[PDB]
Amino acid sequence: MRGSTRDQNGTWEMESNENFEGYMKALDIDFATRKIAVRLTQTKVIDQDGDNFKTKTTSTFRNYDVDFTVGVEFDEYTKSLDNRHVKALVTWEGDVLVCVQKGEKENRGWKQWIEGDKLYLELTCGDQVCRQVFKKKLVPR
């Protein structure tokens, strides 16, 4: 994948989500939670000021909010998911925003990037990959 810009500011609405179930299962998220969440549309709001990100990902079930500074390791406590601690680090690879979440689970993290007018997010855990695509609702520019 390739990002067309590093500017991810805006509000984005999920248009597709594939293998979210597998990703959730890899995280040991319980059956009932997976069934509720799997096909609920998510909205993602990104407020990005240089290296500082505040993100909110919302549905009518749960929200999944995380704030970070690019290039600064942090203790991510995953209360909205599996209630674990990971050492999270978000870096740029080109114009792809890459997060590695070090901890118990292998190969855990995500990659987020813009292609033109859409936002893409690939979430990984173990041997599972979830691919999400979001259409634009609002961007500043």
Swiss-Prot record:
Forms a beta-barrel structure that accommodates hydrophobic ligands in its interior. It comes from Homo sapiens. The keyword Disulfide bond does not apply. The lineage of its organism: Eukaryota, Metazoa, Chordata, Craniata, Vertebrata. SUPFAM superfamilies: Lipocalins (SSF50814). Intracellular transport of retinol. PANTHER family: FATTY ACID BINDING PROTEIN (PTHR11955). InterPro entries: Calycin, Fatty_acid-bd, ILBP, Lipocln_cytosolic_FA-bd_dom. This is Retinol-binding protein 2. It is found in: Cytoplasm. Belongs to the calycin superfamily. Fatty-acid binding protein (FABP) family. GO terms for molecular function: fatty acid binding; molecular carrier activity; retinal binding; retinoid binding; retinol binding. Disulfide bonds: none annotated. PROSITE patterns: FABP. GO terms for biological process: epidermis development; fatty acid transport; vitamin A metabolic process.
